[PDB]
Amino acid sequence: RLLKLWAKRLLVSPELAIVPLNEFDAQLASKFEGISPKYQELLSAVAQGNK
Amino acid sequence: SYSAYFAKAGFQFPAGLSALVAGIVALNVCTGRPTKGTKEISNAEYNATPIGYLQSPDQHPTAFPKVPGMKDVHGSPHHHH
Amino acid sequence: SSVRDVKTGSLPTNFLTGVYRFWRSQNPAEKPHDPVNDRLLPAVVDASDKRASIGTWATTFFCTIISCNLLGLMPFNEAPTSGLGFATGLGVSVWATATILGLSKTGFKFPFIFVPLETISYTFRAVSLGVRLWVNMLAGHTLLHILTGMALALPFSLGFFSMVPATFGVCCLLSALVGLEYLVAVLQSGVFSILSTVYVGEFNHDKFIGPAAKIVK
Amino acid sequence: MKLLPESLQQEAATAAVVASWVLWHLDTQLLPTIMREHKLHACWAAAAKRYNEKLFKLNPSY
Amino acid sequence: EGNSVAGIIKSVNETSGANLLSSLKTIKAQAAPIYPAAASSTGYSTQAKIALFGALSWILYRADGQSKAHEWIVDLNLNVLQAAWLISFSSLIPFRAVYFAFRGMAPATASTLNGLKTFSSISL
Amino acid sequence: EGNSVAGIIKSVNETSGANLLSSLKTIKAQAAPIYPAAASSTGYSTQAKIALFGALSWILYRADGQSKAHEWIVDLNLNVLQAAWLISFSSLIPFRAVYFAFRGMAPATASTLNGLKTFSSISL
Amino acid sequence: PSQNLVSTFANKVIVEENLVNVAEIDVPFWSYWLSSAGFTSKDAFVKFAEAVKPKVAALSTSDITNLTVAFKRANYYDKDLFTGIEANVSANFTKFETEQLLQIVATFDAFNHSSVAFLDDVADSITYCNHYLAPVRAGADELATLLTYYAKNGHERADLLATVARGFSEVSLGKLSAAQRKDTVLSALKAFQTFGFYPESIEAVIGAALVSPAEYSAEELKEVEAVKVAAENALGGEFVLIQEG
Amino acid sequence: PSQNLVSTFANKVIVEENLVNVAEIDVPFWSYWLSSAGFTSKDAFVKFAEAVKPKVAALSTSDITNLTVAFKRANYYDKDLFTGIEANVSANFTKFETEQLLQIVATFDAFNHSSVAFLDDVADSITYCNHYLAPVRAGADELATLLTYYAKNGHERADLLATVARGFSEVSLGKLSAAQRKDTVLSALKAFQTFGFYPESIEAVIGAALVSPAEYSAEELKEVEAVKVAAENALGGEFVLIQEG
Amino acid sequence: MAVTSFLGKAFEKYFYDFSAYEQFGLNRFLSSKGQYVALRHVGFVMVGVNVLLAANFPFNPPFPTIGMCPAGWEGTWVCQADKAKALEMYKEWKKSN
Amino acid sequence: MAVTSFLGKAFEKYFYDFSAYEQFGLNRFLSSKGQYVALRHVGFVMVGVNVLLAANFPFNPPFPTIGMCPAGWEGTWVCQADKAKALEMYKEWKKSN
Numbered sequence A: 001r002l003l004k005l006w007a008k009r010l011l012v013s014p015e016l017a018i019v020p021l022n023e024f025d026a027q028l029a030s031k032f033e034g035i036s037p038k039y040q041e042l043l044s045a046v047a048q049g050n051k
Numbered sequence B: 001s002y003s004a005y006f007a008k009a010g011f012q013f014p015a016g017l018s019a020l021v022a023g024i025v026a027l028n029v030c031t032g033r034p035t036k037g038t039k040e041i042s043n044a045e046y047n048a049t050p051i052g053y054l055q056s057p058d059q060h061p062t063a064f065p066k067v068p069g070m071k072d073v074h075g076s077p078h079h080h081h
Numbered sequence C: 001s002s003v004r005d006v007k008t009g010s011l012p013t014n015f016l017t018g019v020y021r022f023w024r025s026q027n028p029a030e031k032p033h034d035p036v037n038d039r040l041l042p043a044v045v046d047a048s049d050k051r052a053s054i055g056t057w058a059t060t061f062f063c064t065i066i067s068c069n070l071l072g073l074m075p076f077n078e079a080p081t082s083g084l085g086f087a088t089g090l091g092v093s094v095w096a097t098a099t100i101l102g103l104s105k106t107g108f109k110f111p112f113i114f115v116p117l118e119t120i121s122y123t124f125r126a127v128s129l130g131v132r133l134w135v136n137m138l139a140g141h142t143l144l145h146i147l148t149g150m151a152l153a154l155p156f157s158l159g160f161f162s163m164v165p166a167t168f169g170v171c172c173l174l175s176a177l178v179g180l181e182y183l184v185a186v187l188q189s190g191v192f193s194i195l196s197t198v199y200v201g202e203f204n205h206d207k208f209i210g211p212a213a214k215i216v217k
Numbered sequence D: 001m002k003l004l005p006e007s008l009q010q011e012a013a014t015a016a017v018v019a020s021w022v023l024w025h026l027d028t029q030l031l032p033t034i035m036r037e038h039k040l041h042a043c044w045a046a047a048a049k050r051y052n053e054k055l056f057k058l059n060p061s062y
Numbered sequence E, F: 001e002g003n004s005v006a007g008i009i010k011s012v013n014e015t016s017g018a019n020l021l022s023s024l025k026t027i028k029a030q031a032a033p034i035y036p037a038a039a040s041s042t043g044y045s046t047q048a049k050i051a052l053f054g055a056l057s058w059i060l061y062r063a064d065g066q067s068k069a070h071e072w073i074v075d076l077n078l079n080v081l082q083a084a085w086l087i088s089f090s091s092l093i094p095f096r097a098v099y100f101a102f103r104g105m106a107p108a109t110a111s112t113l114n115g116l117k118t119f120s121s122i123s124l
Numbered sequence G, H: 001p002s003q004n005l006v007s008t009f010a011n012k013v014i015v016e017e018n019l020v021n022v023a024e025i026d027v028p029f030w031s032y033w034l035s036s037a038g039f040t041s042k043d044a045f046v047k048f049a050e051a052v053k054p055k056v057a058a059l060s061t062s063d064i065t066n067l068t069v070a071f072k073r074a075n076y077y078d079k080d081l082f083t084g085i086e087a088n089v090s091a092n093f094t095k096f097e098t099e100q101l102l103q104i105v106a107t108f109d110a111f112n113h114s115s116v117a118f119l120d121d122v123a124d125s126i127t128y129c130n131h132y133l134a135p136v137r138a139g140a141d142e143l144a145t146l147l148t149y150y151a152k153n154g155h156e157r158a159d160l161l162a163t164v165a166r167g168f169s170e171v172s173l174g175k176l177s178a179a180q181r182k183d184t185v186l187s188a189l190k191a192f193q194t195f196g197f198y199p200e201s202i203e204a205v206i207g208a209a210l211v212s213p214a215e216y217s218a219e220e221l222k223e224v225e226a227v228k229v230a231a232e233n234a235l236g237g238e239f240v241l242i243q244e245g
Numbered sequence I, J: 001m002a003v004t005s006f007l008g009k010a011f012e013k014y015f016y017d018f019s020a021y022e023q024f025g026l027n028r029f030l031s032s033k034g035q036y037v038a039l040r041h042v043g044f045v046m047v048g049v050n051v052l053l054a055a056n057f058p059f060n061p062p063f064p065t066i067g068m069c070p071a072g073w074e075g076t077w078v079c080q081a082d083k084a085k086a087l088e089m090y091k092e093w094k095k096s097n
């Protein structure tokens, strides 16, 4: 069920495989604008596809 | 990726152009007056006149005139001069 | 009954977006003294209901005149705005639209010896808006007819493909007048509809309704 | 040359038919299409800060 | 046509653990959007023929009455002057710079879309 | 679209003996022909409106010039005489007998099809 | 015998029993336009209410709006039709407009008929499925009918109340006659205190009464001044009318 | 300098290297119409034969007919193009017509090129996929080319021979000139005895020679009279010319 | 051919890479390409004027000549500045010629 | 309504089962239905003639009257058998009436 959980999240949203699982909540903050921009601009461009 | 969906429908007119063309034509044919170089005559004159004499020379200019003012027909020689 | 499908980001969609947003920018809405929130939102929506659609009217007159002016530069075609009733019939119709808007600001009643002189200079706007479009489309095309007759007098008299430095200097003068006519075709459709926003925008003013009762602090 | 037309009312009504078709075509066909793709972009660019903060407060996934 | 994420969720729920990682490319492609395939030509629509016969019927009719216009050689030599600029506009207008200049007139194409920043919509 | 008998043969070959007799109604319906379903109206086509506006534009134009024809009251009273027989033809023509009388004019509908007599095409 | 043949034709062909026999095809078209011409006819509307009941589950949203405001004007209340109408609305709530829902609710508010699933799907549709300035285009006599229909049925949707409170301003109440503005201001303040929701645009429905208090009683102005003090500490300040300029 | 500019334009813009650069789009259109105007040009046709080879597998049947009769008139034989042509015919044999196959075979009969799969799919198409009176519309000089192409390659299809034997009559041979009728009658009787097939309409190709034997040799009339006696006992009777009336 | 698909591809490779500014050399005589277009333009007009005149040359000009005559005509109908006069002289000349 | 779907169903039940040959009784007076149609036909003509005449009654008839006059007219423009005469008398009558 963990493998099926992440199967749906990476079929819909495959860019999630570039934020490693241990470095994920090191990004968060209390506000959404406070989230660390280490992966924000990379996640936005991997989400736009391979072209 | 969607480029071949827009090549399927080809040319298409603007979406109400038949009301523009039927509005410009209905202004050019419903003038309410004779047709620009002609004059309405009686039926007794129209049935009695040859079609070479109903024509005016001014209304048939020469299609590529060698002298400016050449006309193709000559009309009625029965002038009221 | 089935509408056509539009690609997003088409070039005619991008051009007409920028054209509409240009003419809408000519009569901008005025900022109220209050902050715009849900209290002031019906006063802002009612302020937009009482403004004339000059953003739509000016891009109607931009797009119908630049299409007519540029027909005169297509081969085998003449500009419809080179006709007196077409071009001045658009100028009177803008002037009457401004006046009907300004007459309705009251109850359709028409407004010492000063006011016949404000009226004359205002009634001349009617004919000046259309005649400026008509004479520009006529005087540019007429000069081109005269100079093509002069530039045809040289190869008719002299040789075909002979004595070519005489006709080259006038075929390049004819070519630079058709090029100026492309500039006058675009400018006079811009000047007609810049001025339509100015004339119609004079009577584009109503009272902001606003809050009549408040709970301060 | 040609200065006055054969009918001034016929040319003035040709201008009113052409400019009212352009008014109809803009209001009905062009400007709904303009605003459907102008305001998808504009609503998303205006809401983006409050949409994402509302969604951050909602999903329990953190 | 139900939504493809509920088709992904259903197709991943009723697979086994052994064939989960093999099925992931056929659940990926069952929920890809349709991009319709490039059909055969069937060229020049019933309205593209009206647009080109009606433009040829207009150009012949306008050149017919231009040739008997009392200034007929001046009228027919103005179509040469006017079509000379249609030729010089195909050779001077930067058509890629003009295309990207009209894309900046519209705020919809002058930028990228801006919502939904991926860290707000995770499902862990 | 391959043929439905090879779809029947394939679907019956790859079933088991236990679920053969249960599968026979879904192999029957997988090889039934398509009879397309009754869509919504979208009534009066773009050519049925031309046919009725153009017929109204003809009837008004013919009644316009009939009313100034110097025998205008005789012309307008002939349309009453002519439309009286269109009314009496809706009430006197046996329309089911006429339909089956035109079906006998054509030899394609005057009989039944005649080939392929079932004992020649068995497969035992 | 010309007068005899016309009178015989008039008593057997043009009656209201054949007027309701051509009206069986499309019901909510003929139901709506006849009732707008003044054709109430309580037991001719029963022929409508059963001819349309196999169709209510598949009607368009402008057909459903045409049924309810026709059956409001004819004042006829068919409870097993009006549950098929509210099951059209609460199944297609995303397709209805605030112009259409404010006329369906005012029918359901006269005939005191509600569901909890209907009251949520009307409030979900006005708030989320419709433009947020659609209350501004509504006219405050219809919004006060929606405000009391949620206070009669005890339904507190604080998201709907912030939406309907947009459509109360000097603009929307100024388009009302002062007989109808008074019937709305008292009806809107009675609903705003039933939920205890005092938005910042309650100072336009209060100020529509305090700028002309000579149309009100002292009993109704005690009702108004009860809401004014209840809204003053909620909004954190004191009421003050503005003389313009 | 008017003559200089035209002559400079003529030696760099209108040549045959740019005539074959506009002819790269649709090959079998331009291949067919140029070769009918007399444009053979053996190494301009090699530019055709490689520009069309990625397209031969998806051509229509009137395109394939246009390739073969153009490459017959230009007499150019590209063996790896002509296997893609016969793989278009033998994959779409139901779509070809006898008007089209009799021109494709006569190209394949000049350039001695055949397959067994091609010879069956041409004979299956003329006999079964095409109307049985399509040989009657053919003209007997094309049917004799098809008869010998099946006798050169030793292919006995007795169903095809009964089909092609319809198109031999007094009508079809009477439309031939007597130089071409003689070249056909000898060519058809040589193929009818190679299979030993003597249909009832062999008495019209024999009788086309025996009604005018002054155009034939005694060697060729020995060839004709060999087939006449071979056909007389097959049909069970004796030959007799008919004087008309 | 396919009538919309052949010469669209022929006009495409006549429009784009067919360039007489480089295939005919012509950089030896011309400075830029922006001035090759600026006299191919004027060259198109001078060629088009000389074709339109020569395709029907014996004509009395509608335009005002400036006191000049084409060739050995000089008193004929071609150079006559009165148009009703030259119509009479053209009708006499047409019987002979 | 749906504009093509309502009155198509109304005309259908006016065409088919709406029958004044039985709803108005009328078998008491008429023998068959084949002769009810044969005088509803002639009844349609007599009604349509009398409507077309009466919808514009004061008119000088184009058709030849047989020497008869409608009502108290008898010498007016309505009964005048010379048409240029009656045009003069109608123009006088129109000022008064």
Ligand SMILES: [Zn+2]
Pocket: C078, E075, E078
């Ligand atoms: Zn011109």
Ligand SMILES: [Zn+2]
Pocket: F075, F078
């Ligand atoms: Zn008639």
